[PDB]
Design a protein around this nucleic acid. Structure first.
Ligand SMILES: [K+]
Ligand SMILES: [Mg+2]
Ligand SMILES: [Mg+2]
Ligand SMILES: [Mg+2]
Ligand SMILES: [Mg+2]
Ligand SMILES: [Mg+2]
Ligand SMILES: [Mg+2]
Ligand SMILES: [Mg+2]
Ligand SMILES: [Mg+2]
Ligand SMILES: [Mg+2]
Ligand SMILES: [Mg+2]
Ligand SMILES: [Mg+2]
Ligand SMILES: [Mg+2]
Ligand SMILES: [Mg+2]
Ligand SMILES: [Mg+2]
Ligand SMILES: [Mg+2]
Ligand SMILES: [Mg+2]
Ligand SMILES: [Mg+2]
Ligand SMILES: [Mg+2]
Ligand SMILES: [Mg+2]
Ligand SMILES: [Mg+2]
Ligand SMILES: [Mg+2]
Ligand SMILES: [Mg+2]
Ligand SMILES: [Mg+2]
Ligand SMILES: [Mg+2]
Ligand SMILES: [Mg+2]
Ligand SMILES: [Mg+2]
Lengths: 156, 7, 123, 205, 129, 79
RNA sequence: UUAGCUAGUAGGUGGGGUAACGGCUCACCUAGGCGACGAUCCCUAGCUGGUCUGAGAGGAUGACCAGCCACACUGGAACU
RNA sequence: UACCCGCAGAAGAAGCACCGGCUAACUCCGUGCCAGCAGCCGCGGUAAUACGGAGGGUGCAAGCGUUAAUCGGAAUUACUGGGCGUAAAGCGCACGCAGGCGGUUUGUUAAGUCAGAUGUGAAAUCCCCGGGCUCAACCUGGGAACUGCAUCUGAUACUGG
RNA sequence: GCCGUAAACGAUGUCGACUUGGAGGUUGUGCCGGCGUGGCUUCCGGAGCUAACGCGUUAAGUCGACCGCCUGGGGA
RNA sequence: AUGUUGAUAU
């Protein structure tokens, strides 16, 4: 059902009396392919368990993206920490024109056609967060019509 | 010095 | 910067700088070896790295690296230099072209022969 | 400007039958199709995004026998032409004469079909064409020449074509030894194994 | 000193929305009222009203939908330090047409939709979304 | 209509000539701000009517001196 | 890390001159004219259509092709 | 001459770079911080996928590499599109000329601004739909485009007078 | 009389507008110990902002005007 | 009160 995707595995270290304790972080995204997407970040001493932890977190932290026929409603800007992402609706058969972290979010979310650019830090975690922040705060015509107290064709 | 250590 | 500030003083571009100024925007230059010698690399490397001081046709004096195992250069050898620093010889910004002018190709070389001026073994 | 080397080691790298032998017998009997070529063949390393994309592009190229410069020009064309770039690319490759001559069933392989075209044994709407890369357009008759109809290569190939699946976009006559290129193949007509978006990504990066 | 009362109105709305204020009150002006109409008609604010003679006070009643404020963003575009004028062909679509650009045309202040229909360009006052 | 420019008089000290500043107002090509851009013209003023301060209409004409190819049409405003 | 530059200089009148307007030239008169919207001075440079790159805005560039300019051993001069 | 026809015979026709990560491709031997490699990080100190050779492999292919040079990636001069408490960055503080900017109402003007029209924006080039060289490159028909400039005539909300 | 610089620091330019609170200090004032209302100021903290530390109506929040300044480390 | 230093690479 859900498309699970591993974005980044990273080795991290705490020092102790003995020396360095290494451990693994795994950043994953899960999505249905119809505008429901969630990222998970898991830590463990081994890579498998980090991933299994990441996937479990991702499934419980999915949000709803209001898509428009496999692309975005409008241009969106996401920011998290040092990651400033920009995403634009594209024509059919564009594909996802995006960096690898944004690519994975957009693929599993069900965005087929999009022009994306990551400005600033391309730190995988913060890029993923900025992207999903972007998607979740993208307005559709229906909710815009709703809030403004109009019809969809008055808006469009 | 010592013409170049820690013992 | 305010718009009025930019109107008064526009954005200056980063001027940018050659790492190979003695070539003077030429792919190669010829020169004459004044000294051919060895020198030790910086940390963490240890070697006797084969360099030559070279007087180029355009008057510049530069150090150039001699790559490959063994060479035939002496003082008053005419050689061709190209761009390319040696990371662990500070000051060395050029490589000699093996198998151009008086510089011979490397003896008994078989792989990457075009890089070291070595004609194809007759098979 | 052609691959003249061993054909099965191409297939073994891709891990897939690329039809570079006639199909008189199974690929399994002629080589270890499972194992990749060479000393470290049994090793199956974890392949990167780039490696996946590369291997996909190299698969499609190796089927149609297109070298990289010419393949990239097809991509540039496919991107220029309107529609979905990926399906445009596969259309252009199917449009090639040496492919059309194979698809109808005159060559056993595409390299044989390429030898046919090369050696002035093919005609397109009357005229002799000895260019493999020639784009055969819709409503075009492709024909064996009368001197070339006596070849055992052509008859033997036409038998193997019956064992293969028939192109819906081609109508052929085995007796007359000529066929019409009716229309451009749709993506549905071509195999689902090819992941054309990977090739688009590869050139789009 | 005060040198952009429009930016000040937009800011009073922006801040007032963030602070979940019911209404926001600025000093009035003809151009402020003209903008307030476009925000009313497009359904971003609920109502407005001018009050006074010597010193009139505009008073916008703000909208909230499902808890959230309706004005998602509201950006000054043309400003004293840099005036932006657009021709009819180059009028901006805010949020792919889901938001408005308030445009001062020769036939008064209006949305970029209304300006496209009227075949006019003009000064781009603000975006709203 | 005949083509004319209009501008302020900035000098009247020349005999039968004035300097006229044509104030233009131009979008900056890069930065988009609207900029005042003067252009000064030596202008023929037969009779020597105009003085510094006066707005004047002017038209282009044949060369009259080294620097003059513009003539006074009318004084629009005076100081 | 060039701030002042300019006396045919800037304008006028008349005579001369040019195919032609004109300090183009001359005599006399006036004392102007140019400049921080960068004059003057210094360095570099043929300009454009275009070319390369770029999502664009830009950045870089001006080989071939075509338009314009300039030069013809160096300096100067006219003649036809 | 293009092109066509005939002849004979696989005959006359494959290299270059790369394989530690970035980056597609791994083993053995030799060497032992030496010899050497290196775009960046780095590799070599006696068990080197990084040197040198070999075998195998990967990528390109009548080319392949290397060097030079431009733009890109570089939002790393940020107009579009950046910053300045501590990362580089607020003048030690003020007054103030030029400059930039300017509360609110009415009228007027029409400079900015906007609208329309006309002229111009050489041809080639680019782009689109066609055509011609067996194909392609290349050549070429018609368009689109040339985002500009000027002139005239209107609009008057905003900015300026 | 000259010098003209300091970690000359809040390492935070000036002016204006707007945006939950709490506890003080100091200096006016109005109404009758309480109840307001001004100025300046110390500490905490909310949203928001911030790489984080923190800032937080005296902003490093939300905006406008103008100025100053930065563009890897060194060389300097 | 005072009270120094720790060769190179890894
Ligand atoms: K000592
Ligand atoms: Mg960065
Ligand atoms: Mg070729
Ligand atoms: Mg005269
Ligand atoms: Mg003249
Ligand atoms: Mg020159
Ligand atoms: Mg860009
Ligand atoms: Mg130029
Ligand atoms: Mg690999
Ligand atoms: Mg060994
Ligand atoms: Mg380069
Ligand atoms: Mg840039
Ligand atoms: Mg920065
Ligand atoms: Mg410091
Ligand atoms: Mg600092
Ligand atoms: Mg200060
Ligand atoms: Mg002051
Ligand atoms: Mg005003
Ligand atoms: Mg006008
Ligand atoms: Mg054709
Ligand atoms: Mg044409
Ligand atoms: Mg043209
Ligand atoms: Mg007015
Ligand atoms: Mg100081
Ligand atoms: Mg300070
Ligand atoms: Mg606090
Ligand atoms: Mg010590």
């Amino acid at each position: 059902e859900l498309q699970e995707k591993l974005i980044a595995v990273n080795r991290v270290s705490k020092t102790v009396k003995g020396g360095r304790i290494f451990s693994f972080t795994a950043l994953t995204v899960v999505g249905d392919g119809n505008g429901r997407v969630g990222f998970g970040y898991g830590k463990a001493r081994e890579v498998p368990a980090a991933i299994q932890k990441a996937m479990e977190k991702a499934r419980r932290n999915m949000i709803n993206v209001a898509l428009n026929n496999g692309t975005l409603q409008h241009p969106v800007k996401g920011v998290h920490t040092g990651s400033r992402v920009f995403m634009q609706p594209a024509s059919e058969g564009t594909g996802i024109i995006a960096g690898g972290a944004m690519r994975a979010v957009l693929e599993v979310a069900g965005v087929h056609n999009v022009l994306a650019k990551a400005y600033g830090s391309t730190n995988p975690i913060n890029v993923v967060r900025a992207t999903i922040d972007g998607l979740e705060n993208m307005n559709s015509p229906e909710m815009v019509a709703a809030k403004r107290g109009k019809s969809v064709e008055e808006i469009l | 010095x010592x013409a170049x250590x820690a013992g | 910067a305010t718009v009025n500030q930019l109107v008064r003083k526009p954005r200056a571009r980063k001027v940018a700088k050659s790492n190979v100024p003695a070539l003077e925007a030429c792919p190669q230059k010829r020169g004459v070896c004044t000294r051919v010698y060895t020198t030790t690399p910086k940390k963490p490397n240890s070697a006797l790295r084969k360099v030559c001081r070279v007087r180029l046709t355009n008057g510049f004096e530069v150090t150039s690296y001699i790559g490959g195992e063994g060479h035939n250069l002496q003082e008053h050898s005419v050689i061709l230099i190209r761009g390319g620093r040696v990371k662990d010889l500070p000051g060395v910004r050029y490589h000699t072209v093996r198998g151009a002018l008086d510089c011979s190709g490397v003896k008994d070389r078989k792989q990457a022969r075009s890089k070291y001026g070595v004609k194809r073994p007759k098979a | 400007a052609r691959y003249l080397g061993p054909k099965l080691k191409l297939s073994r790298r891709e891990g897939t039958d690329l039809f570079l032998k006639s199909g008189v017998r199974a690929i399994d009997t002629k080589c270890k199709i499972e194992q990749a070529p060479g000393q470290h063949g049994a090793r199956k390393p974890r392949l990167s995004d780039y490696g996946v994309q590369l291997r996909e592009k190299q698969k499609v190229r190796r089927i149609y026998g297109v070298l990289e410069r010419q393949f990239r020009n097809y991509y540039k064309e496919a991107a220029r032409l309107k529609g979905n770039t990926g399906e445009n690319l596969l259309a252009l490759l199917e449009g090639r004469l040496d492919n059309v001559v194979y698809r109808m069933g005159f060559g056993a392989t595409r390299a044989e079909a390429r030898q046919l075209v090369s050696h002035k044994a093919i005609m397109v709407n009357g005229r002799v064409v000895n260019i493999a890369s020639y784009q055969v357009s819709p409503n075009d008759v492709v024909s064996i020449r009368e001197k070339a109809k006596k070849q055992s290569r052509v008859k033997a190939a036409l038998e193997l074509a019956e064992q293969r699946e028939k192109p819906t976009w081609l109508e052929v006559d085995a007796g007359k030894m000529e066929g019409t290129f009716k229309r451009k193949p749709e993506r549905s007509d071509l195999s689902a194994d090819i992941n054309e978006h990977l090739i688009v990504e590869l050139y789009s990066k | 000193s005060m040198q952009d009362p429009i930016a000040d109105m937009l800011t009073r709305i922006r801040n007032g929305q963030a602070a979940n204020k019911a209404a926001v009150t600025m000093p009035s002006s003809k151009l402020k009222v003209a903008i307030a109409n476009v925000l009313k008609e497009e359904g971003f604010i609920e109502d407005f009203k001018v009050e006074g003679d010597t010193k009139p006070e505009l008073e916008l009643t703000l909208k909230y939908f499902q808890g959230k404020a309706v004005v998602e963003s509201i950006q000054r575009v043309s400003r004293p330090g840099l005036r932006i004028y657009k021709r009819k062909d180059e009028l901006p679509k805010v949020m792919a047409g889901l938001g408005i650009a308030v445009v001062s045309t020769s036939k008064g202040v209006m949305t970029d939709r209304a300006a496209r229909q009227a075949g006019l360009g003009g000064e781009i006052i603000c975006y709203v979304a | 209509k005949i083509r004319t420019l209009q501008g302020r008089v900035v000098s009247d000290k020349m005999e039968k000539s004035i300097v006229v500043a044509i104030e233009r107002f131009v979008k900056h090509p890069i930065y988009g701000k609207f900029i005042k851009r003067t252009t000064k013209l030596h202008v023929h003023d037969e009779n020597n009517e105009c003085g510094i301060g006066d707005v004047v209409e002017i038209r282009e004409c044949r060369p009259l001196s080294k620097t003059k190819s513009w003539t006074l049409v009318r004084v629009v405003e005076k100081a």
